[PDB]
Ligand binder design. Structure first.
Ligand SMILES: *C/C=C(C)/C=C/C=C(C)/C=C/C1=C(C)CCCC1(C)C
Ligand SMILES: CCCCCCCC/C=C\CCCCCCCC(=O)O
Ligand SMILES: CCCCCCCC/C=C\CCCCCCCC(=O)O
Ligand SMILES: CCCCCCCC/C=C\CCCCCCCC(=O)O
Ligand SMILES: CCCCCCCC/C=C\CCCCCCCC(=O)O
Ligand SMILES: CCCCCCCC/C=C\CCCCCCCC(=O)O
Ligand SMILES: CCCCCCCC/C=C\CCCCCCCC(=O)O
Ligand SMILES: CCCCCCCC/C=C\CCCCCCCC(=O)O
Ligand SMILES: [Cl-]
Ligand SMILES: [Cl-]
Length: 264
């Protein structure tokens, strides 16, 4: 049902996608160790924001690892090209994993925005419901990326509505609570918003690849886009969230944070 299943791949195409996914794994698990060691310099009220980055690194790293082994399982070099065997490859499992990872990315934002108690719970709940609506309708949409492009588009339009509404909640909370943030991170959090807008928008672009580039090179393009998007939305984003957590910790008088920023 996926466009990947339609084509044979050159050695070049097949190896590049393998390398993309493998590099993706390495980057996320490398970053994991960074988030782990810096977590001790985060104040208790923000430390879960850095923990969530560890959780996202392993979740994302595992899905990329799984995709890579699925890639090599599904294809074998036969008569001059990589051809589909008995096992299958699908991006569908990325969608399932987003059900977990996207709420994690959203929660760590709310934490460094200094949201607490009732407002934190309510905002998280609405954000997660919006994200889940986006992911599920998109998941259903991509079931038709071969059989019914028109249906892919309509589900994608519904999904985009959830996307836009989710982004509006995010933007509203960010620009409203920006003033509450310490150590100059009121400026930093603004760049985080635009990083999210940029990186997350790469995913619906990948989603539409079967509509504007339905060939093996389009398959490569989609994996390339996912790689850019994953690293930007999880790793670079995580690094900024953690920086913001540490800076606000130091400004709030957390000594290990102050000492850490002092060494650099
Ligand atoms: C780490 C993974 C992330 C941040 C995934 C984000 C995914 C999206 C923003 C997905 C968006 C979609 C649309 C807005 C329309 C097409 C269907 C989706 C689900 C791909
Ligand atoms: C930076 C270099 C990126 C690697 C290019 C891989 C594409 C190829 O070798 O076919
Ligand atoms: C934050 C950005 C992260 C960027 C990750 C991507 C790094 C590698 C990118 C690709 C370089 C282009 C490779 C040339 C493609 C060759 C075509 C092919 O063989 O199929
Ligand atoms: C392989 C990676 C091993 C990573 C172990 C690092 C332990 C961190 C110690 C700590 O800060 O609590
Ligand atoms: C095939 C029917 C798809 C139904 C989509 C349900 C939308 C989910 C909304 C928020 C949870
Ligand atoms: C909750 C939103 C559920 C779906 C809204 C209906 C619009 C998209 C469904 C398309 C159905 C189809 O193409 O057969
Ligand atoms: C051409 C790859 C980069 C595309 C970035 C533009 C999409 C995100 C816009 C906000
Ligand atoms: C080419 C440009 C690629 C961008 C690479 C991003 C690298 C890591 C981001 C680190 C986040 C630090 C937050 C900003 C620090 C500060 O405000 O002074
Ligand atoms: Cl604290
Ligand atoms: Cl993920």
């Amino acid at each position: 049902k996926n466009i990947e299943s339609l084509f044979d791949y050159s050695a070049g195409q097949f190896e590049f996608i393998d390398h993309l996914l493998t590099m993706g794994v390495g980057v996320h698990f490398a970053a994991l160790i960074f988030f782990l060691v810096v977590s001790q310099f985060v104040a208790p009220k923000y430390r879960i924001a850095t923990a969530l980055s560890c959780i996202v690194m392993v979740s994302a790293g595992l899905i990329l690892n799984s995709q890579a082994v699925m890639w090599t399982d599904a294809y074998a070099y036969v008569d001059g090209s990589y051809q589909l065997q008995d096992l299958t490859f699908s991006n569908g499992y990325r969608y399932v994993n987003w059900m977990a990872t996207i709420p994690c990315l959203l929660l760590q934002l709310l934490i460094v925005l200094n949201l607490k108690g009732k407002e934190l719970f309510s905002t998280a709940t609405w954000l997660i419901l919006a994200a889940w609506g986006m992911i599920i309708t998109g998941y259903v949409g991509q079931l038709y990326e071969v059989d019914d492009i028109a249906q892919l588009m309509i589900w994608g339009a519904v999904s985009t509505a959830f996307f836009v509404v989710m982004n509006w909640i995010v933007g509203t909370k960010i620009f409203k609570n920006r003033a509450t943030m310490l150590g100059g991170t009121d400026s930093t959090i603004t760049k985080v918003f635009w990083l999210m807008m940029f990186a997350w928008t790469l995913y619906p672009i990948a989603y539409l690849v079967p509509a504007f580039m339905n060939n093996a090179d389009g398959v490569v393009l989609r994996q390339l886009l996912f790689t850019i998007a994953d690293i930007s939305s999880k790793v670079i984003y995580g690094l900024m969230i953690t920086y913001i957590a540490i800076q606000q910790s130091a400004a709030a008088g957390y000594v290990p944070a102050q000492q850490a920023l002092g060494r650099i």
